[PDB]
Design a protein around this ligand. Structure first.
Ligand code: FAD
Ligand code: MG
Ligand code: MG
Ligand code: NA
Ligand code: NA
Length: 330
């Protein structure tokens, strides 16, 4: 049996999603797996999306301040993990920030900053501790979510791509695949090893925060690892000489003012890397380092505005600088 390399990519969940596979299985088996990957992404866009009016999440948000809503086990599990990271990060990551994000989401569309009293009012409706998850213990008991605070809105944008990458890895493994690179709008999962007959680590690129996105500034060699990066210049608009990016500091209600240009988290679960990258960007370097000591199975790489790069002990020897303007501190 010969090794063959496959890739497929589609526009879905508002971005470019690509999966690359190396396999010795019959091509028809790989094709079926990839068909299912992209069907999964279409289906889950309709479960998780905060943009669409017809999503499961949109329906849940429509019931804020009312009775508990039945959800599938998968959505319940994601919400549980999101609330876990909200608690651990002191709300730096907050999955109930929809009231505020929606004010800034219309700002992006109109290139305009939201009113101050409006933002202050919005922040009163973002207490994630008022998201109540309950699941009975008996056979076939339903999973439920209640949004106790009137007007509160879930927004899972900062954890959903991680969740989907993990679901895709589980699907690929179910199809007896063990070598893939999953890339959901830059949210990466490196499954197994690639092929050169030699097996090699995947070389995951991390962009210049101010780059045009084309070329990586750095590459990191990894196996069985997610790599997720949060940065200011990922998504922003400008008004009167000021840049407003998409990652909100829940204390201020404004885009976070932080001491790093990007943070990349390396974790065995992409769900976790995705939530932590957002939290760490909001928290800044020193507080991120404190948070990450609570997760010894995770590594991190910080790119500072002065182009210094600091990486934790578990990955620093795996980092190669490609753009010599950047310096890896050792
Ligand atoms: C199912 C799904 C469907 C999507 N559909 C569309 C679409 O139709 N059109 C489109 O343009 N984009 C779409 N997106 C992308 C969407 O805009 C997300 O906001 C984006 O994936 C997050 O970008 P990020 O990973 O770089 O940053 P992250 O840092 O991982 O997430 C930032 C996002 O999380 C929210 N957020 C901001 N601050 C915080 C905070 N402190 N804590 C927690 N959350 C915060 C906001 O939604 C923000 O956009 C979709 C994403 C998903 C997951
Ligand atoms: Mg994130
Ligand atoms: Mg993300
Ligand atoms: Na209010
Ligand atoms: Na800050």
């Amino acid at each position: 049996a010969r090794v063959r390399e496959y890739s497929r990519a589609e526009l879905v969940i508002g971005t470019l999603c690509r999966v690359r596979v190396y396999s010795k299985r019959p091509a028809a088996e790989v094709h079926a797996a990839l068909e299912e990957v992209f069907t999964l992404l279409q289906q889950q866009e309709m479960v998780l999306s905060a943009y669409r009016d017809d999503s499961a999440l949109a329906a849940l948000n429509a019931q804020a301040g009312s009775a508990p809503v039945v959800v599938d086990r998968s959505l319940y599990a994601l919400l549980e993990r999101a609330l876990f990271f909200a608690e651990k990060s002191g709300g730096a990551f907050n999955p109930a920030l929809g009231a505020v994000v929606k004010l800034w989401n219309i700002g992006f569309d109109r290139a305009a900053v939201p009113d101050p009293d409006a933002l202050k009012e919005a922040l009163t409706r973002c207490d994630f501790r008022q998201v109540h998850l309950r699941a009975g213990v008996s056979v076939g008991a339903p999973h439920t979510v209640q949004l106790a605070q009137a007007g509160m809105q879930l927004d899972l944008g900062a954890i959903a791509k991680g969740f989907l990458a993990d679901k895709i890895v589980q699907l690929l493994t179910a199809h007896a695949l063990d070598s893939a690179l999953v890339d959901l709008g830059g949210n990466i999962f490196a499954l197994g090893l690639k092929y050169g007959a030699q097996r090699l680590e995947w070389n995951v690129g991390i962009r210049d925060p101010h780059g045009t996105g084309q070329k990586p500034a750095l590459v990191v060699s990894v196996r069985d690892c997610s790599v997720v990066t949060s940065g200011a210049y990922e998504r922003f608009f400008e008004r009167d000489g000021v840049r407003y990016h998409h990652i909100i500091d829940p204390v201020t209600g404004f885009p976070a003012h932080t001491d790093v240009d990007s943070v990349s988290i390396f974790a065995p679960r992409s769900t976790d890397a995705d939530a932590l990258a957002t939290a760490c960007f909001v928290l800044g370097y020193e507080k991120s380092c404190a948070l990450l000591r609570e997760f010894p199975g995770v590594d991190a790489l910080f790119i500072f505005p002065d182009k210094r790069v600091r990486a934790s002990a578990g990955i620093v020897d795996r980092v190669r600088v490609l753009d010599a303007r950047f310096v890896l501190e050792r």
